[PDB]
Symmetry: none
Subunit: 437 residues, 2 copies
Amino acid sequence: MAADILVVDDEVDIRDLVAGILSDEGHETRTAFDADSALAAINDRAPRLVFLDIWLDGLALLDEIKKQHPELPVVMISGHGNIETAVSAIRRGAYDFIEKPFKADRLILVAERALETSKLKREVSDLRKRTGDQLELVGTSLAMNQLRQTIERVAPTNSRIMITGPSGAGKELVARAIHAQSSRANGPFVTVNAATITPERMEIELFGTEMERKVGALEEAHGGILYLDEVADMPRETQNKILRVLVDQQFERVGGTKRVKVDVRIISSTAQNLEGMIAEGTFREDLFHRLSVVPVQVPALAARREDIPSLVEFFMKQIAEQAGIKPRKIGPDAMAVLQAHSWPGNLRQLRNNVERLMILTRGDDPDELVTADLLPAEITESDQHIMALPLREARERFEKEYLIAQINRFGGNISRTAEFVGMERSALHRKLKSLGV
Amino acid sequence: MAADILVVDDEVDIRDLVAGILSDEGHETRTAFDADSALAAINDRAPRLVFLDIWLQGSRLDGLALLDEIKKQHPELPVVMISGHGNIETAVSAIRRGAYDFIEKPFKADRLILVAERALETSKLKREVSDLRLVGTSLAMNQLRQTIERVAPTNSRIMITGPSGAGKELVARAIHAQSSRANGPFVTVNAATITPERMEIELFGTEMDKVGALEEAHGGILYLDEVADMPRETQNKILRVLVDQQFERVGGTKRVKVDVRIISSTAQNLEGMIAEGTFREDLFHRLSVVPVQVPALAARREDIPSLVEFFMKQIAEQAGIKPRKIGPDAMAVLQAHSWPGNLRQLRNNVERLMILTRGDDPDELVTADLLPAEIGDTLPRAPTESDQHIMALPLREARERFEKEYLIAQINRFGGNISRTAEFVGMERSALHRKLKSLGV
Ligand SMILES: Nc1ncnc2c1ncn2[C@@H]1O[C@H](COP(=O)(O)OP(=O)(O)O)[C@@H](O)[C@H]1O
Ligand SMILES: Nc1ncnc2c1ncn2[C@@H]1O[C@H](COP(=O)(O)OP(=O)(O)O)[C@@H](O)[C@H]1O
Ligand SMILES: [Mg+2]
Ligand SMILES: [Mg+2]
């Protein structure tokens, strides 16, 4: 909207003209005539945008501004004569360029777009800190290093990827890392979660509808990557259509005849045994062979236990950022129990456990260690729970469980249990029977 | 970038040149010479970008009318207009109507290349923020939402009070989003996380031999998460920001002017701190021009079922776990709990339930036994040989203690509504009242 802009030019009429139009728009404008006055203005306060004259030199100052302030957009002011240098400045780090003489509306528009893009990148950084959704693969283990090198090798190719690994191991993160290291890194990254899509709406989610517009995952993925997250959750009807899209890169939109042609790089994943599903007749053999082109195996947390301390530390920093809870020191006993667990939910389960620990100790002293007793049990019927029952039934269940527990406490000695609970021997017998013990 | 670009211009010379330059850059370019050919091309496949002439002669709809039709069908599809020299008023009109930018005839190939790249980059960044990104029907939530709506368009300093995980930061972002600084930065300072020795450096930066949060927040909002953790020297410096709209960097005399709207929060008793001499009296009153209280989750138990459903849908989107049916037992337990970690704690427990039931029968209800000890052990449940207090008591005393604990827990669950509690526990309401009075609970 209305930001702090620094106008760097050697001519006063340009400094006054640019600063004038922008200030009149609602911005705060400061000026500088050379590199030293520019660097000093940035030292007074970091601006949200810079307008830099190519011939002051401009390109050297452009490198310096971008070195110290990578997130600060710089728009070049260029002479009518040469666009070659203005284009050279874009490659060196400049956002855009403006040509003399310019219309005021052009100057206003360029400033707004440079600020909008800068705001979008800042909103991206801010939202990644809240989602705890960064694109970095933490792990010093050999399983992690081999995975990182597999990513580095398969990403620059155009090959179809098949990702195998258990739930929460990092299959989606690997797919995003493959995308960020591919030729389609600037192209879209579209995800299809079969598990979280109703069967009655799968066709519409993948192919869209004929004519505000409902655009399917395949059309949205055109020129980029389509991530089929957990293919094993696709019904027979869905498996058929996917196979059919793989043969010709074409499909119809639901309700329509129009055959849309797409150009998509497919990355698939499974935490399931697909070859076994083929034997059970639940998964198509032709689909499997077409999706299983280049394999990428993401290791289980059980295959990289030595990474758990580094991951706990990494997750504690994310939650410190999200919640404002200071990171804690995990006790050697609690860490030993964590490192020994089988982790069916892998890293997603580890993060969830780290977050619960941080919530529970939020009030505690900083020097206090997180102890093994704080760890949950894994590390009756719904109709029978006391909280879900009315008073009489809830009272009856409590009475039954109390007596059962008191009997076990006295190791089956009914007469001593009776005496302690405040009952006569035969009355306890009749009560136990009436309660169905 | 290898994008699908639709080029719409009535001039064949123009279409060929735009399609030619962009196709030579590595893009896939398509052309149309009127509205109907353009809409037929969009129907073939939605492009990633549209170049659109403002005029469009010999067409069913002109350039601005087609711009409107493209944006209606595809709101996130960037449209760059093609305009003639001296047509800037009509081009600026297209920007206000939904166009991303415009290119003025005649243009350099490198200019067209740069406009395409910038439009696509902005489109992609919007796609990221949409992918990554206040629930409750309670009067409490409705009052909070109408408080945000009222004070967000003002320029007044806010003091947000409430327990940890209740939604203070989310309230601050909601105020930011509805304020005149919504396009400005939203900078947070986690005071509980920063060491007292590094607090000044984080807020005010250092002289060069570095950029503080206040300098980053210029033009926007600075969110001071937990003001109680600020040292006395930091307190005096914030006071100068509030009164003088300026400060000095760490180890300097150099003035730094700032235009910030401060939002402060605390889960602590600041009044208790002023009484003890650890927090400045004048600073507290200046920080609390407009007080906003976020209610504890235990004070809005009505919203727990809605929050459970909202959090399930959110984890479904993140993890790819199908949302499940929470058993009446698990819901009764979740609703009755005190929640010292509030909405964060609730969310973390819903995620826990979805992680642990991943791969189980979709019909199978999520039961209360899956919840951890801090949830289950604070509420009525079947006793065991390990429950020292119950075991030390005889039958009548143990049954009376259970009655008291069960009724209180059910009351909590129903937010103190005795008529609703009576209905569930199997009593008439006056009978429940007489039973509570008799029990003295
Ligand atoms: N190597 C890693 N380093 C850091 N965080 C990771 C790593 N692998 C996964 N995560 C995180 O763990 C969680 C689960 O990972 P995810 O990619 O969704 O796995 P999957 O697709 O196998 O279920 C996510 O929050 C993700 O960011
Ligand atoms: N009413 C609400 N509806 C949905 N989610 C909420 C609501 N209030 C808070 N949250 C969520 O609860 C969690 C804790 O909120 P947060 O703002 O971080 O609390 P605080 O700042 O008080 O510690 C976050 O995940 C947040 O998005
Ligand atoms: Mg000049
Ligand atoms: Mg024309």
